[PDB]
Amino acid sequence: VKNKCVNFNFNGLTGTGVLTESNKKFLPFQQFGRDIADTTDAVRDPQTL
Amino acid sequence: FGAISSVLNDILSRLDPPEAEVQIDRLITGRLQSLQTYVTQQLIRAAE
Amino acid sequence: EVFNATRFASVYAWNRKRISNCVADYSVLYNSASFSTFKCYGVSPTKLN
Structure with a gap:
């Protein structure tokens, strides 16, 4: 579910926030990304990549 | 700050309250x- | 194949088995009365599931 503030348990990484499509692209070995302040900002879906 | 992890969610989802209380207290x-x-x-800067 | 096996190695030659690429159910292990010692360090058993 996207564009709604929900609790997400992404492959054991729990949190709360709004999931949205990303113009950002990941290399095909990275699982999740961090901001300049090292807060999690992006994730990779375990079932859809 | 001495805790096992720097994320409260990890401590909450990994430990029961009786032992996670110490880690949460250290983080606090x-x-x-x-x-x-x-x-x-x-x-101080506002006074300046 | 590890819990319900018939052979256990010696103490100085303890046998290590790597577990990966599967789903593990620790709740049935913890709630069973067959085990007389079940203590977890760094995690709580009830959350292992």
Whole structure:
């Protein structure tokens, strides 16, 4: 579910926030990304990549 | 700040309250000290 | 194949098995009365599931 503030348990990484499509692209070995302040900002879906 | 992890969600989802209380208390102490330092510096700069 | 096996190695030659690429159910292990000692360090058993 996207564009709604929900609790997400992404492959054991729990949190709360709004999931949205990303113009950002990941290399095909990275699982999740961090901001300049090292807060999690992006994730990779375990079932859809 | 001495805790097992720097994320509260990990401690909450990994440990029961009786033992996670110590880690949460250590994190609270560290973050409170940091915030107090920031507020004091902001007060001094605001006076300037 | 590890819990319900018939052979256990010696103490100085303890046998290590790597578990990966599967789903593990620790709740049935913890709630069973067959085990007389079940203690977890760094995690709580009830959350292992």
